[PDB]
């Protein structure tokens, strides 16, 4: 039942660790279970990557990286819609969105507070 908790000490600086850590994971599972699920037909691997590691805080940089360039660009209306959806969820004070790509069958967890 209990999730494995692995304490990793820092030499420069246990039931208590385990309790706090399990409570944290459980809170995330709770919030994740209420997160919106954004669904798209297809996403380039590179696009999903940049979305999965890029802060929403600078809108133009997010768009610039997601729009990409030239022959390998991502449609602007489509990228922009993804941003506004993610951003809307973020501004509600919430941390998570799930991004599902049908072509791939793959879901990814997006941290909106990155």
Q: Where does this chain bind its own copies (CB under 8 A)? A: 3-13, 16-18, 20-22, 24-25, 27-29, 32-42, 49, 52-53, 75, 77-78, 81-82, 85, 98, 100, 102, 105-109, 111, 114
Nearest Cα to Cα of residue 48 among 113, 102, 94 = 102
Distance, in Å, from the CA atom of 107 to the CA atom of 19, rounded to the nearest integer, reads: 29
Shortest Å distance, C-beta 41 to its own copies: 6
C-alpha dist (Å) from residue 103 to 54, 69, 111: 22, 22, 22
Paired with 106 in beta bridges are 101
Q: Judged by CB, which is closer to its own copies: 16, or 70?
A: 16
Q: Judged by CB, which is closer to its own copies: 6, or 93?
A: 6
Shortest Å distance, C-beta 60 to its own copies: 20
Distance, in Å, from the CA atom of 55 to the CA atom of 96, rounded to the nearest integer, reads: 13
Q: Judged by CB, which is closer to its own copies: 21, or 63?
A: 21
């Amino acid at each position: 039942n209990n999730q494995k908790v692995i304490y990793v000490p820092n030499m420069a600086t246990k039931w208590v660790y385990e309790d706090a850590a399990r409570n944290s994971s459980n809170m995330i599972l709770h919030n994740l279970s209420n997160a919106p699920i954004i669904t798209v037909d297809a996403l380039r691997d590179e696009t999903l990557e940049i979305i999965s590691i890029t802060s929403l805080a600078q809108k133009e940089e997010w768009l610039r990286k997601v729009f990409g360039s030239g022959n390998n660009s991502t449609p602007r209306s489509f990228a922009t819609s993804i941003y506004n959806n993610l951003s809307k969820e973020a501004h509600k004070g919430n941390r998570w969105a799930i991004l599902y790509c049908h072509k791939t069958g793959k879901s990814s967890v997006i941290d909106l507070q990155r």
